UniProtKB/Swiss-Prot annotation:
Disease linked to the protein: Jansen-de Vries syndrome: An autosomal dominant neurodevelopmental disorder characterized by mild to severe intellectual disability, psychomotor developmental delay, speech delay, and behavioral manifestations including attention deficit-hyperactivity disorder, autism and anxiety disorders. Most patients have variable additional features, including feeding and gastrointestinal difficulties, high pain threshold, hypersensitivity to sound, hypotonia, broad-based gait, and dysmorphic features, including mild facial abnormalities, strabismus, and small hands and feet.
Main location: nucleus
Keyword NADP: no
Residues at which Mn(2+) 1 binds: D47, G48
Shown segment, full-protein numbering: 1 to 403 of 605
UniProt GO cellular component terms: cytosol; nucleolus; nucleoplasm; nucleus
Keywords per UniProt: Autism spectrum disorder, Cell cycle, Cytoplasm, Disease variant, Hydrolase, Intellectual disability, Magnesium, Manganese, Metal-binding, Nucleus, Phosphoprotein, Protein phosphatase
Cofactor(s) in the UniProt record: Mg(2+); Mn(2+)
Organismal lineage: Eukaryota, Metazoa, Chordata, Craniata, Vertebrata
Name of the protein described by the UniProt record: Protein phosphatase 1D
Complex and partners: Interacts with CHEK1 and CHEK2; dephosphorylates them. Interacts with MAPK14.
Cofactor detail note: Binds 2 magnesium or manganese ions per subunit.
A GO BP entry: response to radiation
Reactions the enzyme catalyzes: O-phospho-L-seryl-[protein] + H2O = L-seryl-[protein] + phosphate; O-phospho-L-threonyl-[protein] + H2O = L-threonyl-[protein] + phosphate
Length: 339
């Protein structure tokens, strides 16, 4: 069952109209002694907020925390998903220890930085997907066909999602519509012995987050229960890749998905793939095309563009290799990339 297929990967991110770039992306391909030096491929999009520090920390450390966990190289998927979940948690817990080193807010309080994190890990014919937040992951599947259908395989962790609101209200928080957007409302401040700032002023400085799960956001720690109101535990899923039917995996931040719906995005990739081999080295990758398309829609709607990021993975049943901004991967050939 050790199947042969190829991937072609592109990635692009743009700051949009924001003053800082807090989106990050990551791609790591490395041989696994487990799969007899067949390579595992890790892809991630992290949409940071409250400062770039958390997203940058996940960029540098999330994959290492994941692949260290017991059961990660197990052949049983339930154990792989369990290891991936533990790696998210370990990365979150490592940020807590880093918090003193991250820059203070403009009022002198500890950093409020946090980040969504969406991860795709391909090993063999299996695709593991883990996420916290709203940087969605979309598959394209061809059922032959000249139409590729989008499938959304992650659900955004919005505060008003019922499972999330239940968890938040159970810790003593609330979910409130603030200016048309539902937000987590937490009023329990992080109090110290040596800190100067007034407690009532700490309370007013607590963020109102638009996601209910993230890595970081350590202000959400609940001293009473020991839980974090903004949860670092990801949803996990496993899918069997069928190179005859699966054609695309898109990971993206909400800068992309707020402008470009899943089917629009998958149908655009299907159109760009034709063009990409007519412009050759100098056409836009699918990822670059998606980001620029979203930026065009932000502008056309007269809105400041968010940070916008995408990773597009094209799946091919062939294993025979011209776009300079695309990485070709055959995982049974032990490629190494950024590793
Ligand atoms: Mg952001
Ligand atoms: Mg965003």
């Amino acid at each position: 069952m050790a199947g042969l297929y190829s991937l072609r990967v592109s990635v692009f991110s743009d700051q949009g109209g924001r003053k800082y770039m807090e989106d990050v992306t990551q791609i790591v391909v490395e041989p696994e002694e487990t799969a007899e030096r067949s390579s595992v491929a890790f892809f991630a999009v992290c949409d940071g907020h409250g400062g770039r520090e958390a997203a940058q920390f996940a960029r540098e450390h999330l994959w290492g925390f994941i692949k260290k966990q017991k059961g990660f190289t197990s052949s049983e998927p339930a154990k792989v998903c369990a290891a991936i979940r533990k790696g998210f948690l370990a990365c979150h817990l490592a940020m807590w220890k880093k918090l003193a080193e991250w820059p203070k807010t403009m009022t002198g309080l500890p950093s409020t930085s946090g980040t969504t994190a969406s991860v795709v890990i391909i090993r063999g014919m299996k695709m593991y997907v883990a996420h916290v937040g709203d940087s969605g992951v979309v598959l394209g599947i061809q059922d032959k066909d000249d139409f590729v259908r989008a499938v959304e395989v992650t659900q955004d962790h919005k505060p008003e999602l019922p499972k999330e609101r239940e968890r938040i209200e159970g810790l003593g928080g609330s979910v409130m519509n603030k200016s048309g957007v539902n937000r987590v409302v937490w009023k329990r401040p992080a109090l110290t012995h040596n800190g100067p700032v007034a407690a009532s002023t700490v309370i007013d400085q607590i963020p109102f987050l638009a996601v209910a799960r993230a890595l970081g956001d350590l202000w959400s720690y609940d001293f009473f229960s020991g839980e974090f109101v903004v949860s670092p535990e990801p949803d996990t899923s496993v899918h069997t890749l069928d190179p005859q039917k699966h054609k695309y995996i898109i990971l993206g931040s909400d800068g992309l998905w707020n402008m470009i719906p899943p089917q629009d995005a998958i149908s655009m990739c299907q159109d760009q793939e034709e063009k990409k081999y007519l412009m050759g080295e100098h056409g836009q990758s699918c990822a670059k095309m998606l980001v620029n398309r979203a930026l065009g829609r932000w502008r056309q709607r007269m809105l400041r563009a968010d940070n916008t990021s995408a990773i597009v993975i094209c799946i091919s049943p062939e294993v025979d290799n011209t776009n300079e901004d695309e990485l070709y991967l055959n995982l049974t050939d032990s490629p190494s990339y950024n590793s």
